[PDB]
Design an enzyme around this catalytic site. Structure first.
Site, PDB file in Angstrom:
ATOM      1  N   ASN A 148       3.720  -5.719  -5.754  1.00  0.00           N
ATOM      2  CA  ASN A 148       2.569  -6.104  -6.566  1.00  0.00           C
ATOM      3  C   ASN A 148       2.824  -7.449  -7.252  1.00  0.00           C
ATOM      4  O   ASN A 148       3.964  -7.859  -7.465  1.00  0.00           O
ATOM      5  CB  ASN A 148       2.188  -5.011  -7.584  1.00  0.00           C
ATOM      6  N   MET A 149       1.737  -8.158  -7.561  1.00  0.00           N
ATOM      7  CA  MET A 149       1.813  -9.454  -8.224  1.00  0.00           C
ATOM      8  C   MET A 149       0.772  -9.511  -9.332  1.00  0.00           C
ATOM      9  O   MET A 149      -0.391  -9.176  -9.101  1.00  0.00           O
ATOM     10  CB  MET A 149       1.563 -10.603  -7.238  1.00  0.00           C
ATOM     11  N   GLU A 150       1.196  -9.938 -10.521  1.00  0.00           N
ATOM     12  CA  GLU A 150       0.338 -10.148 -11.676  1.00  0.00           C
ATOM     13  C   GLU A 150       0.634 -11.551 -12.201  1.00  0.00           C
ATOM     14  O   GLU A 150       1.774 -12.020 -12.131  1.00  0.00           O
ATOM     15  CB  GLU A 150       0.591  -9.086 -12.798  1.00  0.00           C
ATOM     16  N   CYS A 158      -7.181   0.228  -3.568  1.00  0.00           N
ATOM     17  CA  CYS A 158      -6.397   0.100  -2.344  1.00  0.00           C
ATOM     18  C   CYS A 158      -6.941   0.981  -1.218  1.00  0.00           C
ATOM     19  O   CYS A 158      -6.933   0.571  -0.053  1.00  0.00           O
ATOM     20  CB  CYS A 158      -4.934   0.432  -2.627  1.00  0.00           C
ATOM     21  N   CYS A 213      -4.282   3.616  -5.237  1.00  0.00           N
ATOM     22  CA  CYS A 213      -5.447   3.740  -6.095  1.00  0.00           C
ATOM     23  C   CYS A 213      -6.738   3.566  -5.286  1.00  0.00           C
ATOM     24  O   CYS A 213      -6.724   3.236  -4.095  1.00  0.00           O
ATOM     25  CB  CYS A 213      -5.369   2.706  -7.218  1.00  0.00           C
ATOM     26  N   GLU A 225       0.117  -2.528  -1.871  1.00  0.00           N
ATOM     27  CA  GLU A 225      -0.486  -2.220  -0.572  1.00  0.00           C
ATOM     28  C   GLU A 225      -1.216  -3.431   0.011  1.00  0.00           C
ATOM     29  O   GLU A 225      -1.092  -3.730   1.205  1.00  0.00           O
ATOM     30  CB  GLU A 225      -1.434  -1.023  -0.706  1.00  0.00           C
ATOM     31  N   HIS A 228      -2.162  -5.783  -5.421  1.00  0.00           N
ATOM     32  CA  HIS A 228      -1.440  -4.530  -5.338  1.00  0.00           C
ATOM     33  C   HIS A 228      -0.415  -4.582  -4.208  1.00  0.00           C
ATOM     34  O   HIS A 228      -0.543  -5.349  -3.244  1.00  0.00           O
ATOM     35  CB  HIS A 228      -2.407  -3.360  -5.133  1.00  0.00           C
TER      36      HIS A 228
HETATM   37 ZN   LIG Z   1      -3.909  -0.114  -5.596  1.00  0.00          ZN
END
Ligand SMILES: [Zn+2]
Ligand SMILES: [Zn+2]
Lengths: 294, 292
Positions: free
Chosen positions: A89-91, A132, A129, A104, A102
């Site tokens: 994941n990347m934020e 995704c 989620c 995925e 995400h």
């Molecule tokens: Zn997700």
């Protein structure tokens, strides 16, 4: 002697550590395994494919950039070619929730941008989620994609997305990861070619707004991302995110960017320019230019 | 009169009962409990059949400027008020600025002070983005989702093995009362924007924000930031204000002044997306008010 894998490696079984150590020696290990490398790890550990994928998840999660939450999430997308692709994941601090990636999405676009034609399965630690699940229903694998979760039976995406909505309900017949070529002429230097080729294989049947991003790094490497729309719209992956995903998965940080090009149509229905500029500026990259399509 | 066409699609008795309720040009796209009761008396419909029959009016509120596929939703408040929603797409922006009809209707109820929702009615199964969005609410997985020719089901039915705020141990859910206590001062539009920020939902980034829009006739519409446990389904504050603006029968040329209130050094920043989206809608008078 820095390595983003060291701490995660200590958590792996000793036989897998020994087997993968030669593969991770390169600081810019590409965060994917060739089919022959999957076979080598299986031989050196005795694990079947599902168990090896689970055992590798901490290395994928160690590639993640959860700069806001500090919650690393990893994923492994298993191509029909036999290659496996890590995602994390990347934020992006200073940007918005809408720019996040995400795990995925990261693993899936990793496979797609490396030319994988479709996926047979994806392995994660936590149930994907709803965002995704909707993202995965765009793929040519559709509701049949196998979703592998620790300590539970594998199930198709159908199991997690009852009464699903996707491209077929819009009479779209070319699905994400199917071969696409929008035919814009490719010319210019290596980075310009890359951005145009990324736009040429993008997935945008809802807005017909093609776009691609290519980044040239200080050591000369080029990573590109193709725009990937989604039938439900919001789970669309912008082209910048695809390029930043590859850059980070390959062990680089954002200051490594030396040049950046967005290829798109200046009067398309949807425009990536402003968000591309804003997110790069949040990362301290002020050098971004546009190559015009059409 | 954006309802004229949809009105011709209704049964005659429902048409005659509701067409007076839509008399004002800026009908607020919601029904008071007594108005739902009037419509039920005049048609003999139960609340589920009435809501299905009203979906063309909600869909008439939508702005699917890209796709032209109108989607309506009706959010049933525990108060007995019903709130219309419609999807919004913004030419010149991106897919990330889109508002689904479900998000529109829930945001509508929330910004009108509804405390919680008992159900939502839609014509098409909510997508995975909307299923995740709805798991942020204080109604949780038990929210009833109503679809035509389908059995009603809890959100749990559509989102097995769900992830939501409860998994991150958040105890103040979306639509629960929140007040972050920032001091309210300034002119009316500035206070509206600060008040919008004070009731926003941002337990993941703690980055509070609100947007207020001032129209040519003086009306103010505001929107509060609403984060989501899965991050991406988060609704930015501008989207909440544009939602209210459109649902109440205005178009974007009526925007005269816009204010974003947020913290200058917050972990997440709405300023650039807010400016760019408003500019795509032809609004260039945009200011930023800073929260302490
Ligand atoms: Zn997700
Ligand atoms: Zn939706």
């Amino acid at each position: 002697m820095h390595s983003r894998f060291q701490a995660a490696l200590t958590t792996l079984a000793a036989d897998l550590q020994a087997a993968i150590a030669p593969m991770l020696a390169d600081p810019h290990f590409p965060a994917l395994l060739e089919a022959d490398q999957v076979a080598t790890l299986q031989h050196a550990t005795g694990l079947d494919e599902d168990a090896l994928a689970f055992a590798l998840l901490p290395l994928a999660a160690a590639c993640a950039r959860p700069d806001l939450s500090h919650f690393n999430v990893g994923a492994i997308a298993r191509g029909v070619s036999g290659r496996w692709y890590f995602g994390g994941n990347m934020e992006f601090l200073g940007a918005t929730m809408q720019q996040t990636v995400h795990a995925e999405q990261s693993a899936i676009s990793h496979a797609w941008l490396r030319g994988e034609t479709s996926l047979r399965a994806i392995t994660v630690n936590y149930t994907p989620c709803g965002h995704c699940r909707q993202f995965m229903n765009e793929l040519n694998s559709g509701l049949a994609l196998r979703i592998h979760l620790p300590g539970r039976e594998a199930h198709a995406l159908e199991h997690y997305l009852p009464d699903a909505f996707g491209p077929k309900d819009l009479e779209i017949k070319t699905l994400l990861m199917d071969e696409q070529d929008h035919g814009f002429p490719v010319s210019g230097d290596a980075l310009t070619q890359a951005a145009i080729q990324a736009a040429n294989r993008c997935h945008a049947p809802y807005s017909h707004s093609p776009s691609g991003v290519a980044l040239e790094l200080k050591d000369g490497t080029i990573f590109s991302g193709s725009y990937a729309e989604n039938a439900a719209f919001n789970p669309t992956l912008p082209p910048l995110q695809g390029a930043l995903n590859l850059l980070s998965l390959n062990g680089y940080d954002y200051p490594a960017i030396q040049r950046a090009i967005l290829a798109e149509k200046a009067d398309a229905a949807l425009i990536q320019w402003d968000a591309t500029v804003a997110t790069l500026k949040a990362l301290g990259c002020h050098n971004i230019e546009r190559v015009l399509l059409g």
